[PDB]
Subunit: 329 residues, 4 copies
């Protein structure tokens, strides 16, 4: 039923030279991010900071969509313009986070699972009425923990169950099984684990009859572990990540937007840039949170007189990644 | 952390000549029961009924556990002593339904899945503090619908997830993948579907490292469909059901407490009785709702003068199924 | 060790404007072919007929590989030089059928499974010594039987086992889970069963660490059932087939060479040509047996005087399908 | 024609109280090594004479219910001319046959094996049935030092379950042997975990394949520490761990469980089995030994015809000891 709509949303978000701005922090997380610049965590300050982001001048050139938190999806500018309505003209599609976060998985050794399927069909339905057109759900696997068979299983199984519920409510599911950076593992181990979790996630989605034309992928890049002494330059990170994707994603999938996951901003930019010297079977873009935002918070410093310079910092980094999306950096 | 208590609780519930009184009706559903006897669905009427059940004078000889609704777990008698404190003085284990019900499963043709995992760890911890010691979670499969691959998968997967979450919270999980009566299927088709869903549920439970010595099962018996041509008496249903169990339940599982699911009060007792003519590798007993308490509602009729006769009817139907648990049922 | 050469071979076989000629008939099956044109099934008439195919003068222009039977891989021309050397001179890669055929699967109601894993590692190692560079293994699923869970499972499980064995022996595996035409099923049901069996096959192949850059696919096209009323033009088989391939095959797979399987010598060309109107993420071509061989059989009639006209009949229908690989066919 | 009733009868005959299986299915190469150990030439006649010695031991049938034969021995006769199958029929011993084709490196694993044999297995078992065989054997393995890997464990479970359905359809009761190897330093807990997983997997695939559990036999390794583990395990602990594993994974429909020795002394093999039979079990827990029954026979025979009766006495002494251990009455 939503088939035409889902394919349309996915194509808009998977546009050339455009990526996603992730802004779906919890009220508490946005609070910890606001006190880094000494700003009190009120609903007005969160609303003001979110308005600052969505009204940045030329965002729509480099940002095709924005992942909002539930509170922000209903908020408006001080002018009175609904936030989703401001995004619509910069041709930025409104998305929202729908998972309920990570919880200890029983009978593992410190591994996590992502909850949120209870009531998810109703919640996604209301988010669709409110203007949201794609969803986001993040689950993780830990190489230092294996991952175990059952932890990798629930990450992939939960995602495929979520992808079907999201599409049936009119929301393009973003499928994020994040292979975490934790550990000393080399790039070959992360390639192995990425190939396994994607093969497993895609198998369950096929089982659930998810329409691949109407989904987007948010993977981590194939990189060595955070504590691995053997590092990897942008050329290697590009070669290892592209072969992984070519081995696991069918061409029916329109877009693939990487997470930063603890890289630089420049590393996140060079690595993406090194992947777009050639054509790709799908749109290989970006979907960053801190990588696009940390420049803005410390430039803004809560002072309304620094708003324009902060919104300018947002565009400098959003354009730098759009330059990378086309290899023009 | 709770391993030995789970084993101790499972052995008290799956004890000789005892079974479970399923009392976990919704506020809405318990209202339907009360309307069937012309009693208005108020909180005091529901509380009065639940007090009538758990305060029946001799229930501890035949009932080993009672599945409570979340509201009932915290209620007390009119005299002011707690239900769970009533049950323990009769060596009845308080249990709690912890699932959040059935919901259409996306991209199937009318099939449902059972939700409730979100926050389940915290709810079971609170139910444990309140004195509950076992839990219940009901998922279903429909033979008219197949069931489909992904529907049976989620029935087994969700139950195995729930079983691990409950054991880590200290609640013995009752595992209920009910194969529904609906359809025209014969008893061979029901046995085939039962064997598949139990093989899938036990594989996932093994994967999740569930401790089989601390679980209880609540299957449907192996019967022909509700709308099936040929029918099966107590001896054939006992034969088909025991075959299913012998082929799929490992001996470490201490107890198997069946649901009635749409048979008469008498049929439920006779089927259970026919399964206990010879010893079994596990305790084969009952977990009955509409069977055990149907006669209590009609004897009560909401009238305080009928309280004692309604409790006597409960003990009589409880004593029948306890006799059936030992293959000693005398229907005279 | 064979990683680099497997990638080269898969690219050579997946060249553009080229497909594979399947000539892997058993001695008994090929004898059935010669009896239909009144020819006696001896080893020399089989060798003579296979020489007629391998020695067609232009062949190596529309044909990149040829699937051989185990006997033909070792026999030479009348001159005395090995058939495998003719193929290399024509830039055609020698292939080899490596399965041991279909057998009833236990506890199914009439479903089959494909034998061959026993000794396969040693069998492929010697075929590589004999100059073969790719392999073929055909398993089936039957919509009229479901297919059942365990029947589809073994089809995908065996193919993924074989693919890993063939690669470690140096042969590019051709992966052929054939969804049979049998039954009255429509195109949507064939679409559903095709998507399932390929999801299962690729999952197992991923578990087995099969290198997707060095494999080839031989699927059945997405069509209604042989006994189904609603037909399908080249336009809609093309869009049903390509959407299923795009929903299941990862871009790393170099080539997809289809089987004709009882369509028509005409229809096989129209369908393939319709799938090459636009660029594809992989080389979508043809792997045909009778659609290239049958008019060769009936023109040769076993008489040596018609060798030239029968070899010409081979090339004429080869180019018809090669032009279909380019979307440029009359 | 359907063998369901004969399969059940065979399985119950082979899994009979006080009896176990003599495994004597060594290949010509392997039995040659055995004959060399006592310094005897590996001729076809010496293999036939050693096999005659074992099968013809007087009264062996009181302790041995079945004998796994190699393909060659299944068709051989005594020197006087009586077929070995007829000797075993007079001895009340069921003939069985090894049907797998040995271990082979599994592709893309780091040094792991799989067991081949499915090709032609249906015809082979059909011919073995006509020759008198009534049960079959298939040995697959998993390495703990290698994990085992997911695909190595999968093929072991998957091939066994496929072989079990083929065998039953041909009239042979399948002995299901996924051996967890002794290799490594792993402790008994790691063995337990790997045993539990491979049996959960093997039983799932078999349930999928509609294998009839009433007509199969199991041949597991015991649950013991690895060969190089520094923490050991006496008979009581081996029994506790092994029976827990079986209770948690083997459905009661399975009639018999016949352990391999796989690297234990004769005495510890007997004491381990004896410790598992101090109380009743839901299935017959017995033995399926090769070297633990044969090594003293070869060492006593020495190839010399004058030592035949002393070698047969040696076989009977060991078979009786394990038959006693099966009843728990070895020490007493
Ligand atoms: Cl260890």
């Amino acid at each position: 039923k939503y088939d035409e709509e889902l394919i349309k949303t996915a194509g808009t978000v998977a546009s050339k030279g455009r990526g996603i701005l992730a802004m779906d922090e919890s009220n508490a997380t946005c609070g910890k991010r606001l006190d880094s610049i000494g700003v009190e965590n009120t609903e007005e300050n969160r609303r003001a900071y979110r308005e600052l982001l969505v009204t940045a001048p030329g965002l729509g050139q480099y940002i095709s969509g924005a992942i909002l938190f539930e509170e922000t999806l209903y908020q408006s500018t001080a002018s009175g313009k609904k936030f989703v309505d401001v995004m619509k003209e910069q041709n930025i599609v409104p998305g929202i986070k729908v998972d309920k976060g990570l919880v200890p998985l029983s009978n593992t050794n410190g591994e996590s699972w992502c909850m949120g399927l209870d009531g998810l069909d109703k919640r996604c339905a209301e988010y669709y009425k409110a203007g949201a057109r794609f969803a986001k759900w993040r689950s993780v696997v830990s190489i230092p923990h294996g991952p175990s068979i059952i932890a990798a299983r629930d990450c992939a199984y939960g995602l495929a169950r979520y992808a079907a519920i999201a599409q049936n409510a009119g929301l393009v599911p973003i499928v994020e099984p994040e292979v975490l950076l934790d550990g000393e593992h080399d790039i070959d181990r992360c390639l192995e684990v990425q190939e396994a979790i994607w093969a497993e996630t895609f198998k369950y989605m096929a089982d659930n009859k998810v329409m691949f034309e109407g989904i987007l992928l948010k993977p981590a890049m194939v990189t060595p572990g955070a504590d691995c002494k053997n590092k990897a330059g942008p050329a290697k990170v590009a070669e290892y990540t592209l072969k992984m994707l070519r081995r696991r994603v069918p061409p029916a999938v329109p877009g693939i937007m990487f997470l930063s996951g603890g890289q630089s901003e420049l590393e996140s930019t060079l690595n993406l840039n090194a992947m777009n010297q050639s054509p790709n079977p799908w749109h290989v873009s970006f979907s960053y949170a801190r990588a696009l935002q940390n420049t803005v918070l410390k430039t803004w410093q809560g002072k309304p007189e620094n708003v324009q310079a902060a919104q300018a910092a947002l565009l400098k980094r959003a354009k730098a990644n759009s330059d990378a999306q086309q290899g023009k950096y």
